[PDB]
Amino acid sequence: SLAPEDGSHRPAAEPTPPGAQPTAPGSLKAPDTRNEKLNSLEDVRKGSENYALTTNQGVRIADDQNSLRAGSRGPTLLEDFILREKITHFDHERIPERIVHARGSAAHGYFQPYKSLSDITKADFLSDPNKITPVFVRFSTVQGGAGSADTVRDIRGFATKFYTEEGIFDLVGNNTPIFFIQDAHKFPDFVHAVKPEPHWAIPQGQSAHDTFWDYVSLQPETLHNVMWAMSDRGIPRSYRTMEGFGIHTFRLINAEGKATFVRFHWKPLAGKASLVWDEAQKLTGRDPDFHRRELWEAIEAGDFPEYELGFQLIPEEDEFKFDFDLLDPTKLIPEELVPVQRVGKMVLNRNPDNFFAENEQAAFHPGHIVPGLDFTNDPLLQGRLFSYTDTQISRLGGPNFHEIPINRPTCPYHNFQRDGMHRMGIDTNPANYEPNSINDNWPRETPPGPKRGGFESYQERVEGNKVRERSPSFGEYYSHPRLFWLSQTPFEQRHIVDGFSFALSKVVRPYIRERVVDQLAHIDLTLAQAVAKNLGIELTDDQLNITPPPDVNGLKKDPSLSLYAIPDGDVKGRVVAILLNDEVRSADLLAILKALKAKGVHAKLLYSRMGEVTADDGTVLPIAATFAGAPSLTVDAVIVPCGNIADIADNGDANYYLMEAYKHLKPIALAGDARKFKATIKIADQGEEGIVEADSADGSFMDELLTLMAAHRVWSRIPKIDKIPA
Amino acid sequence: SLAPEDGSHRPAAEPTPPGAQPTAPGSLKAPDTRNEKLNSLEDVRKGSENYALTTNQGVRIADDQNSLRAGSRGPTLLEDFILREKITHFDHERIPERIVHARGSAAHGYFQPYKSLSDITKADFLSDPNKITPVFVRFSTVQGGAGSADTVRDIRGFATKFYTEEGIFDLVGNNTPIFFIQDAHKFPDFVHAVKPEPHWAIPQGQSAHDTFWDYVSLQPETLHNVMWAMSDRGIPRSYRTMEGFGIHTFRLINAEGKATFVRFHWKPLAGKASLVWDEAQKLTGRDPDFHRRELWEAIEAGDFPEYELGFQLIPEEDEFKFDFDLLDPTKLIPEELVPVQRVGKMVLNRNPDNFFAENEQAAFHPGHIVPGLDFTNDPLLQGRLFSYTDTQISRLGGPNFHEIPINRPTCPYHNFQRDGMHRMGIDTNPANYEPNSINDNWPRETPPGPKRGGFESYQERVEGNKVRERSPSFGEYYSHPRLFWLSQTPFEQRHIVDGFSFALSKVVRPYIRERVVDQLAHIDLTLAQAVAKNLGIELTDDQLNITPPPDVNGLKKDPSLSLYAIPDGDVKGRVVAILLNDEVRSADLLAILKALKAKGVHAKLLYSRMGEVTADDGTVLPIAATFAGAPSLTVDAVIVPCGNIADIADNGDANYYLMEAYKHLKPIALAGDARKFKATIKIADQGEEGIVEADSADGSFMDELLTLMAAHRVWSRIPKIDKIPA
């Protein structure tokens, strides 16, 4: 018996805020959170308490501290089958990581539609608002390995496995509404260009290197998604605060056989929010698991990630009514032209028990559709359909990957397929082929119909010759980048210029930088000049005269493309650092902590060492972390209560904590003598927007801080942050 | 043609300093650097210039930009064999990463002994000072994945494959002279404890989490290597500036059959040097590939990593003469007791061509020894001999891993083994067994002998019963941690205290922190009290009264255990930042670059944007990076020449660059009006040791800066840095 007597080794099985308890497997932290897929995994969950340690053959082990040897200082014997089983299993623990999106974080949840969509699709999981479909969701980056950092600049994946009563449907999307390339045949070229370069395998988790920009300069179809990556969309605050998109146009098919074109969306109910680049880059160093942590701790707190599924629907007769091709995955459909119709809500409310078994082995593939859905001829989607089935045969060891527990359907599955490595199902059918008479032809085909029918593809007309040719309708590359640029606020446009400037500064061959600036001059002259100025490049008179591309169907902006132009901030689940001193004003801290608790905002109490400090009135305050241990990077705002400020006033760490928060545009609130820190961040006597200051933390002090938190960051401070060395 | 007409896409095939040219495959950068192993890989090197693009079956491809479809907006066709081969290969690119040491960086080189060692060993590679043995060396971290960061706190691996004329010898070592655990049976327990925790797979590249410290608190044998890991040994400046050790006692066997015990050492001829923790942790964010890049760029510059192989030799009759067991890999042999005898030199002088083919697929294993070497009963070494053979079967896809080009011997190999996945060798032997008459028994066994003989194990006497028992002589856990602590300088001791304090502050369960401070009180009460203070923990009276462990064979300290107590600096290959302004004083820059060039020290010219600036005499200075883009973390020292200092005097990023370099103890040199920056870092007029200043950058200014650089860091500044908010 090695646990403490007080039981402090074990986290409470109740919702608790980040940092309050050690994290734990989902079925131990939240045993009463259930859904049909979580219940169906019970057959393979293994406990541990009160059981003997055994070999994998069930033989109890007496001494798991030593190898068998001839004498206590002698050679190890080959007959030690307990050592060789344990080391054999260790030696073969790893499987290949995913070729792309190897870094990702996943959770269980459930989906429900708001109303029946039976008029536009026969998909069973969208047929009834009282029908709940379990989900498993993995969010990811694209380029880095499974051990790379979370808050890199990159596109993010957003993959949802829906365990429906008519089959698994995987909606395998990203956090931007287009992809970099048009035809799947180029996907190995693009991904080899963005990945670490092959001689030396550098850089990890970064597209800021010469081969990426060489490919982008030579393939202008990439510029639209490059604009989104260089914007603050490339550095989300959390997986909870990004959008999701299926990117391709797919089809919905109803029971009458009508096809409707659809593009899929996820709206984050916590709103849209991103970091700023210096904060994201530094956070890759101080906490490379920040998004994985934030997701797992939000679910442990009850701050469940919620998203609304929405559809952009285009009738079949409107296929050719836009300036861009619906089948081109480098084009978005502006919401000003085709609004997103709300379809249902997904809540992620339980973490896995074992990351390897459930996250690392999950397999999502966009060819996993159900009756009521179908594909289109988008040539990127069409090649994806080949790739996901193929890659799973080597990543997951053979063709029985659907029998790995996380991947199993919850609905029935029966067919004539047999054998393969690690075959689990033992088929009793006398027949392994059809047609058969010896089992009266079971399992049998099922015709298509309104519900519970077999899958049949929509009978789209195909006409043309066998060609390796890009459609001419796809040959336009600059209008959607320009629409995106013009839809951004002025501070978002500055952050884009800064993204391209920093990236191209890391390209060693200067001609590649000059070729990219030339492509920017085809999108918007203001953007091109601002990036050229940061690179020491002067645009030629020819570049200054390139005519801008046309508007997209008459639009010169669409605010739904901006993260911030239309406020959608939500503070629940955010976190505030509170900088303690050795004699805190207990009344300020009561007022601060209860205001945050009332709005579901978490707090972390920080000091210059661990342990406790005692307040003016004797209240013992427990310290969560030190100023260096939990830097401002990890929080959304900073509060300094009054008390003995001279304890921390000359602490370089405390001062730099405020300077870094200030540089990264975070709200800061200073009570009482904590206003002496105004000198550190150069605030005027009369104050400035974004810094909350009062004689105490009472009256309106907390409401003002919370108002700033709802607007996420203090964008008006951007011109002021340069006169700070931080 | 897509290359620029000026040829600036291609790096010069000559030695160039870091950043002067794009990096490149080794055989293109240094085509005239050869050794027998490098030449033997020519059968599988494949070029590219002037060749047609083909499928893997040799069919020329006409259009690599499109899939075959029925009409240019039609569905992709199954008969597109060119798309499916290209995407099948991409879908199967990944193989499992190594179970430990997944993150690593490698190079080719050569070794030769200084004199014949035939009186102590019959190993052929140590027999002749003029017979050179090619090597391939991989350096690595332990815990993180292949995509994790380089400058984490961790142990580093140092594995060397010697391609000898009597077989491959792999010396598979680490950068500290002991390991964490005593018996291989516990390796999966230890590694699971240090690795990301199984529920959520956090944290990457960090031992600062509950399960690692839970295991250490319950297994005091771990304490010795934990002291090394918490010291600055855990954060090397470069793989060129750390020690190597084989850890175990092995045997040397001479031609007369005499056995000598040996421990292996690598001494870095560039000297020992480490980062400081705040710098290391920030560098994991700003350049997670810093060590991989530094190694590659040192070899491209001709700053070839050099190491001296050394042996500690103990006669067989002295096995039991120390206070510790020679077969216990948690104990080191102090050099004051047994000196390291210099044996030979290894030079790494060429990078690979393809990182996956040569580094990712390399297989090192400490059971690959040759005649003239043998094992001992160290119970950690004994279990290693099973594991490397076993893990390579799944990582590298089967039992023919020795036929992957990097792993092949350069000497003959013939036997009766056949088949296995991806078998390359086509055996013509009519026999596949021996004894045979049908091929007159060839290939034939070879008796042991002085040279070119068969391998025979030393006939060690074995006497004991078959037991799973730890030798009582291994049950001492505190004397070697204490020897290490007492041998560090006072600043190195402060960094150890900080390393334990920072790590244990990240352990959520407070009782684990308490148990580890109790273990520290058994090593040294000053260490224990200093850690306990930073944790808010008070030592009990019983803890204050624990008797310190005995000296190790009379030693109070051994200065070979410190990185810094004995000066051993070498500045060649280090790097200075030079902060430019828009009217640099060309006379200062002349003097600076001349003095750096004379000592082999490289420079990086930095400014507030990219492009060029022009000096006072019209010299056009290309800018390597911005002040933000290449932070002070990446350099060894900073020089600010005179000129138009007003251009940069108020630049926040230039001021922060000096604040960070100052906090991280780096030398700073300020010429002329750059002395105005003394105010940012609070240097008195009279100056400060570690800041070089003068009216101009003459010979005397450069000699003072170079002297500071030879001492690596300005330790005397440590009391002054706590106040700087950086």
Ligand code: HEM
């Ligand atoms: C619209 C463009 C695409 C989007 C939105 C997309 C999205 C994703 C996502 C989110 C994942 C990770 C799923 C998980 O979390 O496990 C993934 C993995 C993958 N993607 Fe795609 N992808 C795109 C295009 C492509 C293309 C064109 C190909 C190849 C022709 C491709 C091949 C793969 C492969 C091989 C994997 C790893 C799958 C696994 O190992 O299970 N992707 N992609």
Ligand code: HEM
């Ligand atoms: C003295 C203690 C040890 C040292 C110095 C050591 C050093 C290393 C080094 C440097 C590597 C990486 C080689 C490379 O660059 O590819 C490595 C890999 C590995 N080690 Fe050890 N190790 C030790 C103990 C152990 C133990 C006790 C076991 C298991 C019984 C073990 C199992 C492995 C395995 C399975 C690999 C991966 C090998 C591969 O995939 O090719 N190590 N170790």
